[PDB]
């Protein structure tokens, strides 16, 4: 057994982190006080769920998590929330004033003064690991902390944990649920400095999660609670292999191996199905083929884009529930003769499949209805580059006038770092086009 340390930075990461650890507990039968009756090895053991939970002599299962925010309002909810007993105070780190949606502020002005403390708290959790694999880092692109502080933390983690893997769960900025116009700056600044430090990043576009909540859950005005309970379902589907018995994606290393043949192109597209409104009278349960086919619909992708006009470098199918290999292969053969699935010539044309028999757990009172089987597809498509294009374009509109740039230079950042980050994105976009277009 090898441990994984989760790190939640900023409001987005903390709130999402809260929704995921709630789900992890309900999936592993861990109660709010940390007790786990099913665990027969008291105060120890090297089980699959121990990759995310340590154990105390008192039988408490403590997440291997750290929460970091430059302002205490969001982390304060965790300290007094339903699962306040899972964590101890050392795990929840809060400042007094935030980065004000300013990358430079979270990276330089305030980041420089708190980085050495965060690292010390992470070291404490690492000291409890007999074979640490790496880190899962949750954060937003738009926040000054989610973007500015994360990139600094990622730089230092590479310095203090050279051979460890680092995966991201990054929230792509969507204006519909955003009250800040400078988020395109922060996103491109943080993607520039984080790129060489992240082995695999899962981008979730709030726009996609928003319309899935309106379309499938009939939520007219989705809240962050709605969005985060949905995101944590997808996150749970991606990390299940690390927490349960199995042979696919058993360690963080296997993610880059199976999803990222080229290092810079480490942004797999995620697609999840089915998402059924729990308020529905009672839905007809979908088959293996119906949910598998749904993985090639744009309406359930975490990032809206057209995979038909890209090229695949890898494709993973992660099933949960009543699923046998025979039905998977039957649906795949049917999707090939119907769908547009163009792989890159230097990659094989295949699918790695993982099946966990336990169907998705639903949060009591949540929005999602219980289903007999679900699937999450992880596919590395060049079509996800569309999202970079949209984002790079907004950056160019503002930066051409240097709008809001003074707020960044005022925190010690040099203006040139803007263009230095933008040029990097221009290279990232060119890399996708060389891989997907003819």
């Amino acid at each position: 057994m090898r441990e994984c340390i989760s790190i939640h930075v900023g409001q987005a990461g903390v709130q999402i982190g809260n929704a995921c650890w709630e789900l992890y507990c309900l999936e592993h039968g861990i109660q709010p006080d940390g007790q786990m009756p099913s665990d027969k090895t008291i105060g120890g053991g090297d089980d699959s769920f121990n990759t995310f939970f340590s154990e105390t002599g008192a039988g408490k299962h403590v997440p291997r998590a750290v929460f970091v925010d430059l302002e205490p309002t969001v982390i304060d909810e965790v300290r007094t929330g339903t699962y306040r007993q899972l964590f101890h105070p050392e795990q929840l780190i809060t400042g007094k004033e935030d980065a004000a949606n300013n990358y430079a502020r979270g990276h330089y002005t305030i980041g420089k003064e708190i980085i050495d403390l965060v690292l010390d708290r992470i070291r404490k959790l690492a000291d409890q690991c007999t074979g640490l694999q790496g880190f899962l880092v949750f954060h937003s692109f738009g926040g000054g902390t989610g973007s500015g502080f994360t990139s600094l933390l990622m730089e230092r983690l590479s310095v203090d944990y050279g051979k460890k893997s680092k995966l991201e769960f990054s929230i792509y900025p969507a204006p519909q649920v955003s009250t800040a116009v400078v988020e395109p700056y922060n996103s491109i600044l943080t993607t520039h400095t984080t790129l060489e430090h992240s082995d695999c990043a899962f981008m979730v576009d709030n726009e996609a999660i928003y319309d899935i909540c309106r379309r499938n859950l009939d939520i007219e005005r989705p809240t962050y609670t709605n969005l985060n309970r949905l995101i944590s379902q997808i996150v749970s589907s991606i990390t299940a292999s690390l927490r349960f018995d199995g042979a696919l994606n058993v360690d963080l290393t296997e993610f880059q191996t199976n999803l990222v043949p080229y290092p810079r192109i480490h942004f797999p597209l995620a697609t999840y199905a089915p998402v059924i409104s729990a308020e529905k009278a009672y839905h007809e349960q979908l088959s293996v083929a119906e949910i598998t086919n749904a993985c090639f619909e744009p309406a359930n992708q975490m990032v809206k884009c057209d995979p038909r006009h890209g090229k695949y470098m890898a494709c993973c199918l992660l099933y949960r529930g009543d699923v046998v290999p025979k039905d998977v292969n039957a649906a795949i053969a049917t999707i090939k003769t119907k769908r547009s699935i163009q792989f890159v010539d230097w990659c094989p044309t295949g699918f790695k499949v993982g099946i966990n028999y336990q169907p998705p757990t639903v949060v009591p009172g949540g929005d999602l209805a219980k289903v007999q089987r679900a699937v999450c597809m992880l596919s590395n498509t060049t079509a996800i580059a569309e999202a970079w294009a949209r984002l790079d374009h907004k950056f160019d509109l503002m930066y051409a006038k240097r709008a809001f740039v003074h707020w960044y230079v005022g925190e010690g950042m040099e203006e040139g770092e803007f263009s230095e980050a933008r040029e990097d994105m221009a290279a990232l976009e060119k890399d996708y086009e060389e891989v997907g277009v003819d």
Partner: protein, 425 residues
């Protein structure tokens, strides 16, 4: 605990400031004695933003009252909520400022500024984490304009990285006390361009026309004009005083509304505005239609004459947040020619469940529009009409000022107009 320190200076500043504390004290359930008597926990959640908590569960506003004569502040202390203010926080002289910027900034004001800062320093030392300062004042007088801007210059020196916001009443010949208001306003505008993060430009002519044309008040008074400023100040600060919409931060709001450091002068708005047909229910479309109509604009500037750099709208009341988005998108997607297209999504909307007193719902408008240059153009043309004959200068040269200082104020604001012009094309 993100505290704000409030300062009100001069006649206009203290009368408008007083009404502000009168309006929000009623929203947070604070009586004229400082005791709370509301019925909702939301009234106390963000209460420490503008109020210090004293013994006995008393809430004393975090405000400092400044003036160079006693008259006005004597009224506040005798006014409705006069007893609510901290006694030590009344700082005043006896000489007055004679509607003279130089007296407020260099002579009379300078004699009194140090003691005013001792109170500001005292209020900040108790803040768990000081967010920033807000000042209410007029630019046409002598104390609020001359000494007000002196206070800002010294506050920035001592707190260089805290946010400095002002609500500034701009003079107008139609609602004028003396002919030198253009002089005092032009000298203050330069101080504001340098040393404030946000300035809410309030034009007394716009306030007058609203009282006359819209509210149908035959003979408006300063008190009538101050009712509007009251409601507007409560609107723009609603997101700071009540929970729900995070990112409610002074610097965060400045970061998103000010794309360029010197262009930080906002046009405020408010809806509804009804004369006494006052009980009619107001729909969301009507709210949005009015909130964007120029007649509800308080800067006496036609937005259709320029372009919006950034817009922030705060809706108050129990309403369909879904229908809000629909109507806001309708205003933009039906007039996108008045928003600069090089700032994507430069219109943001926030909702608030608690409505103001006596209103089922309301909307407050906060616009960073390049049409605000029309306001500085008015003041500049009035300045030049007198300065070209050196009329009334002796009131200032007698306090130690030179003509050169006027010429540079002139050039500084004409430059400010040039900056707004290049971003309009």
């Amino acid at each position: 605990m993100r505290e704000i320190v409030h300062i009100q200076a001069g006649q206009c500043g203290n009368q408008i400031g007083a009404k502000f504390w009168e309006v929000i004290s009623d929203e947070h359930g604070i009586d004229p004695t400082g005791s709370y008597h509301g019925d909702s926990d939301l009234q106390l959640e963000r209460i420490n933003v503008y109020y210090n908590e004293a013994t006995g569960n008393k809430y004393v506003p975090r405000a400092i009252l400044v003036d160079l004569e006693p008259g006005t502040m004597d009224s506040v202390r005798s006014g409705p909520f006069g007893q609510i203010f901290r006694p030590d926080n009344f700082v005043f002289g006896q000489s007055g400022a004679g509607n003279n910027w130089a007296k407020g900034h260099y002579t009379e004001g300078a004699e009194l500024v140090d003691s005013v800062l001792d109170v500001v320093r005292k209020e900040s030392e108790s803040c768990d984490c000081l967010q920033g300062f807000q000042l209410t004042h007029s630019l046409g007088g002598g104390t609020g304009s001359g000494m007000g801007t002196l206070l800002i210059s010294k506050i920035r020196e001592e707190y260089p990285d805290r946010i400095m916001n002002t609500f500034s009443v701009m003079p107008s010949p139609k609602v004028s006390d003396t002919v030198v208001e253009p002089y005092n306003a032009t000298l203050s505008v330069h101080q504001l361009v340098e040393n404030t993060d946000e300035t809410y430009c309030i034009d007394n002519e716009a306030l007058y026309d609203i009282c006359f044309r819209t509210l149908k008040l035959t003979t408006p008074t300063y008190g009538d004009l101050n009712h509007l400023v009251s409601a507007t100040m409560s609107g723009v600060t609603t997101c700071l005083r009540f929970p729900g919409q995070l990112n409610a931060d002074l610097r965060k709001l400045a970061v998103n509304m000010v794309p360029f450091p010197r262009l930080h002068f906002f046009m405020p708005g408010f809806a509804p505005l009804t004369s006494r047909q006052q009980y009619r229910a107001l729909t969301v479309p009507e709210l949005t239609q009015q909130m964007f109509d120029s007649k509800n604009m308080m800067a006496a500037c036609d937005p259709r004459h320029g372009r919006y750099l950034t817009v922030a709208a705060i809706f108050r009341g129990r309403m369909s947040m879904k229908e809000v988005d629909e109507q806001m998108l309708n205003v933009q997607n039906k007039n996108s020619s008045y928003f600069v297209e090089w700032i994507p999504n430069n219109v943001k909307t926030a909702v608030c469940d608690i409505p103001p007193r006596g209103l089922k719902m309301s909307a407050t408008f906060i616009g960073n529009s390049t049409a605000i240059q029309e306001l500085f153009k008015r003041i500049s043309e009035q300045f030049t009409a007198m300065f070209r004959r050196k009329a009334f200068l002796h009131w200032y040269t007698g306090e130690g000022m030179d003509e050169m200082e006027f010429t540079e104020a002139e050039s500084n604001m004409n430059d400010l107009v040039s900056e707004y012009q290049q971003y309009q094309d």
